[PDB]
Design a protein around this ligand. Structure first.
Ligand SMILES: CCCCCCCCCCCCCCCCCC(=O)O
Lengths: 45, 48, 96, 249, 292, 249, 249
């Protein structure tokens, strides 16, 4: 029984840290290219 | 380690020495644990 | 994200020159080009990498690493390299 | 499942062709877009001079030498005095736009070297102080180094990007290499990145555009020595608001 | 009801990527090892395609590497001395709020270009000998434009609107949560520009890079006293960042900082990687070779 | 509902027969098994040389005397230099395996004595210091006592197992007696016990194998004096991973 | 409907990439296979050390010169003293395996020459006698010429393959050319060919692996003179039976 993530004040920014929304999307930094390259292919053909 | 499988062969009139650039990164199954404080930069006084 | 390894972190090498692995035409066969350890948090070539600098903010790491080598010679220059990763227990190999 | 080596970029009345191209970098996977009404704050109707300003501008050509350190530009600053774009940037208080930066450097199959072409958002230029404490003038860079104009500024310490950050990690930014054995151009499409929907094109420079030779240019006697590097850019989806008297700087 | 809400609050584990089994491949046209780093994209090569791997149902948790967990850790951001002895009998001090004065918090923050977050400020105040006698302190937050105090008795301490915290030294550290206060959408640790128009032909040019969207006023601190107390108080301000949003990651600073609000490195540039003897030496003795 | 006195153990190309056997101890009731994919951590495909290494190795024969104290071996260390198992342990970084230890000691119906054959996991050997404080060399045992090889090492103080723990409680470990009036062998099947799925067969010794005479060997004049004790072991379900140059120690 | 020039061969923990490859020769159209129970004769269970021995071994590098005659190896003999394969060949009486031979020779686009890479089954080496009748020692080749080891042996008379058979007809064997203008490697997958299901890896050499320069290496002054030839091989589906003490030769 967990009793946490409860806000005691009227303003929302007084709540604790929001640690339930882990998202991972590395494509925007690792593959920022237009023509998607397959792994098994020669990239420049 | 990097070894010469064969030689580095060039025709005439082209540089005989070149460079290899190494780019390191992590794979999809990379993970970190037990966040701590780094030891990269030191400080002896406040930056005022 | 792939970032440049500072493999040429030798004394005397300054500036951008520290990011280059020199390769040249050999007079003998089966010679050693360069070497480095693959411990990301260890003082060495991995200090210059984004993975190497974020690893220093954490105690323990796990997973496969990845090194991409880019040859920057002439279009006319050809060659073949053997890049070997030696698991723990052995020192740096002395021969190919 | 691969990328073709030939490419043609047509925007406005300009067209750029290349036959040895690596790819086209779409920075952070987002295309340039106009400000949505959900994110806008100014109430004046913006002007969108579609084809008169969104077009390729060939701005500066630097000669790559064996001891070159590199050069950098600031995107809004490099176009503030050219064409219809410069006028709209001078006549309007507010401005926003993406761009498509295209760096061109061709050499023979007997040359070698590699450039690092990166688009650095909020590229704050640092000054290197000679360990002087009392807040001397040499603690902050002059205006010629922060806003180089269209001629660009050559790096003093490319190893630290003239900003105290290591060059080796500059690949965290939208980047591309020009490896003379592989390709002769680098294309980066960059959307408008800023904490504000609009901003002044005169005070604030949204992006820094660096071109740094990692592997030095090397060739043998007899080859063409003058190997230029040309920077061509084009604003994309550029808007302007807050019309008033033209202000130079 | 809301019982289902409170039950789903434990940190749920999402594991790292699994490794699938693979076998040897002998053919042409399929080259997952060959890449083109010039394209600006990182290599998409997998372990399965370069060696023969086994099936590993990976169960290592990745939740600790999130931006929130990386930043939601209170670090020192300011040290304020309330001088009330010796040559400075002020009993008050007005500290300009700037979180870029200390390296550990500064380097972590500069990992990103823009950041939008709420903060939880904590004040650890004590005397020089680390003791905490009962001494009433007032920590008044002075937003940009509010009148700043100039003495321990001035009218600004009435705080009829300014938020103020009264706490003795012997009490547990005062702690308040501060919202995202900024005219912009996010705080900007790097502002490649100037705040005002002009020629910018000054000899110093100290205005370069100063974005007023980050300047959030001052923290006025005083001892609620009728006269001088003869005791100096040190207030350590700790900032814990919550509800974090980061944009445009940057390289982590490699040169030592020199000033608070500016990137400025010494002319003696330190290498990012420590030096070694040659390019073919590693310091790992390993074991004894079986047959050299 | 009972156990037969005869037994035959066949693994690999080796076969061991006994006609006066007590039973076969299955340590902690778990059979040796290969590492499940749920518990593995290394991604390299392991090698499983089924019958070339999983086989009985007769390693050492010690002569039981009336004043003998006992002997001990370390399981991975005792096989690191014999047969195809030794080679795979030297060529691979990682290793895991169970074993079936078989100690043989036969004597006439006119001899007497009892051995205690136990398999001790993580048998850390202690040194007996002569009450010396300043961290002298005599505070830690040398390598010859921690990794005795295939010859084994005879106990210095069998009463405390050379580890400071009482011998009387060594029966908490998987054990078996060789009582000369009852049986002439002791069999212990031991699964791979370690906090890691794989480990180095050179540095870490998973099990200690002790043979201690509790009741001393006694006989009358005319009987055979040389009463040997032979140790035969066999790895079970042995895997190896992380191939590289052969490393001796 | 064609063959790609790039190829990657992955077996074991080794991987070989090539970017100028002709094709892969599958000798006699049969893949290497384990001995079927219908053709086996020995009753002992064979050992199949899958990934520890079936892997690429880079063995020898010979320097191609303008007056070179060629070199030859014997397949089981060249691997008898290397890695886990060598140990299993020394510890077991019986052995069978295929292989994938890979010969590597790269040169600039300004060199020229062609090698003949052939895999000759039962390559019995002949001795050239100086017309001597009385069965002198010079009537049979010494052991250094029949089993050259890992260094190989250079041909004495490549025109007759050192066997009295014409070189021009050596193309009846599974072969491949290394034409410097076309490709830089030669791959031959060879199944186990022998009149017996298993055989001794020490006495009998199943295949001879010859590399003979038909068109001599020619280049002009200024090009790289040292042009090596590297032989990399890998056993496939290797089994061993009849375990006993390790025998060297
Ligand atoms: C009762 C007293 C409470 C104190 C109120 C603190 C308010 C702090 C504002 C939030 C801090 C984050 C923004 C800091 C940005 C300035 C850094 C800089 O660019 O130098």
């Amino acid at each position: 029984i967990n009793f946490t993530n409860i806000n005691y004040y009227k303003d929302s920014y007084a709540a604790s840290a929001s640690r339930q929304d882990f998202a991972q999307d590395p494509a925007k930094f690792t593959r920022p290219v237009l023509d998607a390259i397959r792994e098994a292919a020669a990239p420049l053909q | 380690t990097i070894w010469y499988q064969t030689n580095f062969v060039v025709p005439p009139d082209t540089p005989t020495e070149a460079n290899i650039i190494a780019l390191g990164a992590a794979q999809k199954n990379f993970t970190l644990k037990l966040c701590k404080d780094t030891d990269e930069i030191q400080q002896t006084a406040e930056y005022q | 994200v792939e970032t440049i390894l500072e493999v040429n972190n030798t004394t005397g090498t300054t500036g951008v020159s520290r990011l280059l692995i020199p390769v040249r035409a050999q007079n003998n066969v089966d010679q050693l080009c360069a070497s480095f350890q693959v411990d990301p948090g260890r003082n060495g070539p991995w200090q210059s990498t984004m993975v190497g600098q974020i690893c220093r903010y954490y105690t323990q790491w796990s997973g496969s690493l990845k090194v991409t080598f880019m040859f920057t010679g002439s279009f006319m220059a050809t060659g073949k390299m053997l890049i070997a990763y030696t698991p723990p227990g052995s020192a740096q190999p002395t021969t190919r | 499942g691969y990328s073709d080596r030939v490419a043609q970029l047509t925007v406005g009345n300009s067209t750029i062709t290349t036959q040895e191209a690596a790819n086209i970098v779409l920075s952070y996977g987002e295309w340039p877009e106009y400000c949505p009404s959900t994110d806008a704050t100014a109430v004046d109707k913006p002007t969108r001079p579609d084809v008169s300003v969104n077009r390729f501008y060939t701005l500066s050509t630097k000669s790559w030498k064996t001891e070159s350190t590199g050069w950098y530009w600031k995107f809004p600053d490099v176009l503030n005095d050219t064409g219809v774009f410069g006028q709209n940037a001078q006549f309007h208080y507010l401005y926003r736009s993406g761009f498509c930066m295209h760096v061109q450097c061709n050499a023979s199959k007997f040359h070698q070297g590699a450039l690092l072409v990166a688009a650095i958002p909020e590229f704050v230029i640092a000054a290197s102080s000679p360990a002087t404490k009392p807040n001397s003038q040499g603690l902050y860079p002059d205006f010629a180094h922060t806003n180089p104009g269209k001629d660009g500024q050559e790096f003093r310490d490319p190893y630290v990007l003239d900003a105290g950050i290591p060059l080796s990690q500059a690949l965290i930014f939208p980047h591309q290499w020009i490896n003379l054995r592989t390709n002769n151009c680098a294309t980066i499409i960059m959307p408008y990145i800023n904490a504000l929907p609009f901003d002044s094109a005169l005070n604030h420079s949204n992006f820094g555009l660096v071109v740094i030779p990692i592997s030095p240019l090397k060739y043998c006697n007899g080859a063409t020595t003058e190997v230029p590097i040309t920077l061509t850019i084009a604003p994309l989806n550029s808007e302007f608001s807050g019309l008033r008297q033209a202000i130079k700087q | 009801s809301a019982v289902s809400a409170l039950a789903d609050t434990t940190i749920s584990r999402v594991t790292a990527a699994n490794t699938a089994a693979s076998t040897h491949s002998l053919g042409t046209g399929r080259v997952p090892a060959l890449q083109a780093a010039e394209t600006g994209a990182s290599s998409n090569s997998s372990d399965e395609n370069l060696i023969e791997t086994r099936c590993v149902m990976n169960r290592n948790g990745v939740n600790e590497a999130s931006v929130e967990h990386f930043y939601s850790r209170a670090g020192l951001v300011g040290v304020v001395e309330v001088k009330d002895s010796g040559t400075s009998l002020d009993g008050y001090t007005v500290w300009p709020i700037d979180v870029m004065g200390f390296v550990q918090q500064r380097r972590k923050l500069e990992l990103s270009t823009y950041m939008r977050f709420d903060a939880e400020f904590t004040f650890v105040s004590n005397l020089n000998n680390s003791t905490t006698p009962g001494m009433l302190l007032q920590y008044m937050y002075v937003p940009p434009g509010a009148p700043k105090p100039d003495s321990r008795k001035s009218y600004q301490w009435q705080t009829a609107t300014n938020p103020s915290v009264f706490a003795k030294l012997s009490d547990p550290p005062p702690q308040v949560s501060v919202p995202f206060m900024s005219p912009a959408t996010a705080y900007q640790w790097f502002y490649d520009g100037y705040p005002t128009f002009g020629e910018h032909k000054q000899a110093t040019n100290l205005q370069y890079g100063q974005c007023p969207n980050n300047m959030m006023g001052h923290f006025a601190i005083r001892t609620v006293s009728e006269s001088t107390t003869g005791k100096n108080i040190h207030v350590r301000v700790y900032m814990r960042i919550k509800h974090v949003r980061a944009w445009v990651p940057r390289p982590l600073r490699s040169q030592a900082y020199m000033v608070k609000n500016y990137p400025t490195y010494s002319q003696t540039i330190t290498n990012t990687a420590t030096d070694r003897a040659s390019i073919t030496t590693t310091d790992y003795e390993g074991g004894v070779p079986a047959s050299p």
